[PDB]
Design a protein around this ligand. Structure first.
Ligand SMILES: CS(=O)(=O)c1cccc(Nc2nccc(Nc3cccc4[nH]ncc34)n2)c1
Ligand SMILES: [Mg+2]
Ligand SMILES: [Mg+2]
Length: 265
């Protein structure tokens, strides 16, 4: 979806990505109402192609828990990726600002949205590789959407150790099952209102700890069923981890039986 650059007004810089700035803007194209957009702006030709691979793959997705591509600008500089705008930004920082201010049911709803997005990606054979609360964006109604897409390999970025399943660290075998590990980490982040996973450990400490059977403890006030689901995501045997359809189904059952959520350590 090449977009005429005259249709785009950039309004403010709102963040930084791995290739450049993130801005808020407005897109108005003939036939369509004006919408608010987020804009990544961009190097070698390989880096340009890596940058744009995000748009290539995002444009192929359509799901309420996956950020929607509006278009790209490639015929002028800077080159741009334009998406729907998520007013509340990254989930880890949104939760820190809102520490202790959402109910367990609301937090489960967020996790259910993220798990539905992942179920869709897994169904499309897309392995995310960087599933982390920082890559979940949150709109005005607490709707959570998966972001940070691309087809580049890590050295691309560096493997995100704290979020990465042990077999993906050791052997670089990334699968939807290693994403399920990362999802368990995201659950822990959400229930801890955006605490850093393993905050008191270095990357190497995390690698060594997981190998020696350490798992993150239940966050304060975290329902035991939610922590058990984390522990299930963090099974060493990747084939024993629940798949995303089972994850969504587990969360939906908790939402049906909220009394279950009152059991805490
Ligand atoms: C208003 S605020 O200061 O709370 C704020 C800060 C940062 C981001 C957003 N929303 C926000 N909403 C949508 C997208 C986005 N960043 C991106 C733009 C283009 C491609 C992308 N891939 N992955 C992410 C991404 N960011 C909002
Ligand atoms: Mg990534
Ligand atoms: Mg990333």
């Amino acid at each position: 979806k090449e977009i005429d650059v005259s249709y785009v007004k950039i309004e403010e810089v709102i963040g930084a990505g791995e290739f450049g700035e993130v801005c808020r803007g407005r897109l108005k194209a003939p036939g369509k109402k004006e919408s608010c957009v987020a804009i990544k702006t961009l190097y070698t030709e390989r880096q340009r192609r890596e940058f744009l691979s995000e748009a290539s793959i995002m444009g192929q997705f359509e799901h309420p828990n996956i950020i929607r591509l509006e278009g790209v600008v490639t015929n002028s500089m800077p080159v741009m990726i334009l998406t729907e705008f998520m007013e509340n930004g990254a989930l880890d920082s949104f939760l820190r600002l809102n520490d202790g201010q959402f109910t367990v049911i609301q937090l489960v709803g967020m996790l259910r949205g993220i798990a539905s997005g992942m179920r869709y990606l897994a169904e499309m054979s897309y392995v995310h590789r960087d599933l982390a609360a920082r890559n979940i964006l949150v709109n005005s109604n607490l709707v959570c959407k998966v972001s940070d897409f691309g087809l580049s390999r890590f050295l691309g970025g560096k493997i995100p150790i704290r979020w990465t399943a042990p077999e993906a660290i050791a052997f670089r075998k990334f699968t939807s099952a290693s994403d399920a590990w990362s999802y368990g980490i995201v659950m822990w982040e959400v229930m801890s209102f955006g605490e850093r996973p393993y905050w008191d450990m270095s990357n190497q400490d995390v690698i060594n700890a997981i190998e020696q059977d350490y798992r993150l403890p239940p966050p304060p006030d975290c329902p035991t069923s939610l922590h058990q689901l984390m522990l299930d995501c963090w099974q060493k045997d990747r084939n024993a981890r629940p798949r995303f359809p089972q994850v969504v189904s587990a969360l939906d059952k908790m939402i049906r039986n909220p009394a279950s959520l009152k059991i805490v350590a």
